[PDB]
Symmetry: D3
Subunit: 80 residues, 6 copies
Amino acid sequence: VGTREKLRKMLDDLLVSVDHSGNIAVLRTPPGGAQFLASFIDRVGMEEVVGTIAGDDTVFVLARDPMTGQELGEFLSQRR
Amino acid sequence: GTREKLRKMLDDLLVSVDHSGNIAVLRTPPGGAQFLASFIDRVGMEEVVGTIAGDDTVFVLARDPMTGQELGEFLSQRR
Amino acid sequence: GTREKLRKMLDDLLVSVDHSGNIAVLRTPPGGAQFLASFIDRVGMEEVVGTIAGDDTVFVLARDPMTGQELGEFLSQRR
Amino acid sequence: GTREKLRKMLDDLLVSVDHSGNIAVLRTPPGGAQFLASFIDRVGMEEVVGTIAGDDTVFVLARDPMTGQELGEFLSQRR
Amino acid sequence: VGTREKLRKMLDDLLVSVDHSGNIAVLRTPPGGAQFLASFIDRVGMEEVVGTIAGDDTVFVLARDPMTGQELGEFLSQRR
Amino acid sequence: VGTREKLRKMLDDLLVSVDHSGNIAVLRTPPGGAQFLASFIDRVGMEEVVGTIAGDDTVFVLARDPMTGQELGEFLSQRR
Ligand SMILES: NC(=[NH2+])NCCC[C@H](N)C(=O)O
Ligand SMILES: NC(=[NH2+])NCCC[C@H](N)C(=O)O
Ligand SMILES: NC(=[NH2+])NCCC[C@H](N)C(=O)O
Ligand SMILES: NC(=[NH2+])NCCC[C@H](N)C(=O)O
Ligand SMILES: NC(=[NH2+])NCCC[C@H](N)C(=O)O
Ligand SMILES: NC(=[NH2+])NCCC[C@H](N)C(=O)O
């Protein structure tokens, strides 16, 4: 039903919390969820996102300068 | 727990099931393997000796004498 | 695809092959396991029920009645 | 090496042992699977065809004719 | 024997080195150790830590602003 | 044939793109390639690199201050 609405649903299904410090937004997932969530982020292609790294329950998303991790995390919290 | 989380996750995440020997193989979308296997470990099924998740694949070890096919059969059935 | 990417990657990445039962075991250099298994999944070999990659090891599940030794034999042969 | 590092790590990391077929299954605490399997690979046991570590689970492939139970038996015994 | 002393012992058992640059402290582990170490960090709940990402032998720990990676790494080197 | 030339060949074989923001250079790989590439980086020992974290197709490399992610990513793009 499109990379549009799936975004939301993936976000609502998975995002436990959003935090930030500096040029990084930190996304918390349930255990094992990090790689899954970061895959869609990479795949919708946000160009204020330089890249992402997933661990097990955490994703670091790197804001493209001048954008900041707070601005980045906000841009997300509205997609939910 | 499997009440509303069993079938739902499988539909959300289980792309295909295959098997060989005492192992059932679950394919997920990219990055999905750890996440689905998290749900499987958490119900704590006796016949699941254990799970290993890669990136898009999960290997489920069936407890002998149960077969990998029989095991993959069930998770397929929760759908 | 296996034209120029089959033998080449194995030479680049396959350190050793071993086996037991319906499983062939591929050792790679550190961090190499996901990368090599990516190539294997992508040819989509029928007899490969699936793959799991750790850090330097890949487990390849052979589809019964084929054996893990027979399977490891082929990838060794692409070299 | 297994002198002071064999039993010690297992006590530090091995939560439980199970098995099925030619595979022994080791459960670790969260995130512990790669770390414990690192120690196992490094002794280089002949009968260990190879190891794959997920997040909290390790699959140890026993070299035929040895069984996964017999293999899990030993690591249990180093405790 | 508590999330108190286990901290230390986990730290002593695992921390190969601590480094830093910017808002990140970098922790080096033996191979395969990264996820294990970062699990306890997440679990003791440090609130100057926004989050952590583990690889194989490295953990990136994100300092909460205003705190810095150096201050963060020091706060650790005293727990050992 | 040495940690010298293998660098290049590994880099040419694997580096899809290089990006940067702040004190981090972001390296993109094919799927599953991230851990492999970051292993060699760690192993050639660059001391303007504090550390690396690999995911599945992305590596974050932390520049040692004063060095920046751009300067870091450039130092690489010449090794190819
Ligand atoms: N089950 C675990 N491995 N837990 C620890 C995860 C460590 C870190 N937050 C990450 O996602 O990389
Ligand atoms: N992006 C990747 N690493 N893809 C390869 C996946 C390899 C294997 N199927 C696994 O799940 O472990
Ligand atoms: N750096 C490491 N984690 N080494 C241990 C590798 C464990 C196992 N052979 C795997 O590939 O999953
Ligand atoms: N945090 C998690 N990903 N937990 C699920 C672990 C899945 C499986 N037992 C493994 O070790 O690979
Ligand atoms: N055995 C390996 N995978 N080594 C490379 C690890 C790369 C990076 N330092 C990380 O921990 O993510
Ligand atoms: N097949 C996947 N797991 N894709 C998503 C990878 C997410 C992130 N770019 C990483 O490398 O960690």
